């Protein structure tokens, strides 16, 4: 369960994070059928790759949601650093295969609007981490 307990830790990390910030306001990686972590069309290889990559894209959006504080800098720092541990864990199961500046030109093009714009990033991260915990629990 060093993988269920993990995602959940990070999930509870986001839950506690949304709060410090949802208390003032008040094409991100996503899983498809072809990604195969889906009982039907299951390829443990197409998806184990899908997680690491998605987790790797998300794990760079939290390098904005860092210079986006510092009232809860470790709750903010721990989410980033705990995700790096999750990536390493999944890479250890995997076998290599999959850009920050893409997401820089892209995270500007998209940009309370700076919370509205943090909400979906963390909600989409919550949504993805759910789809991975589900994906993993079967394999």
């Amino acid at each position, epitope marked *: 369960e060093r993988i269920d307990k993990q995602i959940r830790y990070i999930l509870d990390g986001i*839950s506690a994070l949304r709060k410090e910030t949802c208390n003032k306001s008040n094409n991100l990686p996503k899983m498809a059928e072809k990604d195969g972590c*889906f*009982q*039907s*069309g299951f390829n443990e290889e197409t998806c184990l790759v899908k997680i690491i990559t998605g987790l790797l894209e998300f794990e760079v959006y939290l390098e904005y949601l860092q210079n986006r504080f510092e009232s809860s800098e470790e709750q903010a720092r721990a989410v980033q650093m705990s995700t790096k541990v999750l990536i390493q864990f999944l890479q250890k199961k995997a076998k290599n295969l999959d850009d920050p500046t893409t997401n820089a030109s892209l995270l500007t093009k998209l940009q309370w609007l700076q919370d509205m714009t943090t909400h979906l990033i963390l*909600r989409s991260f*919550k949504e993805f981490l*759910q*789809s991975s915990l*589900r994906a993993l629990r079967q394999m």
Partner: antibody
Amino acid sequence: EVQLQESGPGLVKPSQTLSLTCTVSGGSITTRYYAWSWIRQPPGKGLEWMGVIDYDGDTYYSPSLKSRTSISWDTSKNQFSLQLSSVTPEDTAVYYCARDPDVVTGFHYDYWGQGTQVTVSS
Amino acid sequence: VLTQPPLVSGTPGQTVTISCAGANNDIGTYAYVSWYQQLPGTAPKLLIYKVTTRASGIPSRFSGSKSGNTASLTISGLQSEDEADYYCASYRNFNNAVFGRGTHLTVLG
């Protein structure tokens, strides 16, 4: 005398909206890792999942039932309410409130829910 | 679209099967096939969840199965009180739940 209770009406007219509310008892709404669902049942027909709100407070609706449906909540009163816009006599149903014991590893409902009847009529 | 037979009859002794035919993006892609029993005038009661896992208190005779995108439900030994409406449910991507029409179980004889 502990439940998951639904509030009325009752009687709703076509142009009007549906402000149904469920009151959670014996358990906080804000707890890991629950999801709060609205499920409806027409006079003689089958179960219809309307939408959810998890412990985070993020909503998910049925693709046909969106635009019309909006699910709210009040953490202080330990409640979660449903709103159906522009009702039709197709919305005449028994409205259920239900708990998902863990939102992130299932879509099965253990604690239902009891139902309020809601018929649409001029 | 989770297809269940409208009606299913049963020997007042034993045994019956209720099918829940789904698709790739619901029953297929996960194992969230949950079953519910509903007696008239009351709310549905959870029997099975995660295709096979029986709910706490539910008898041994209530069995859960799956082949592909079709889950089935078995009631091994019929009591005259199993006469109810049986509903299947599944997780459809992303963060949705879908139910079948239902299956009326008639205990006969």
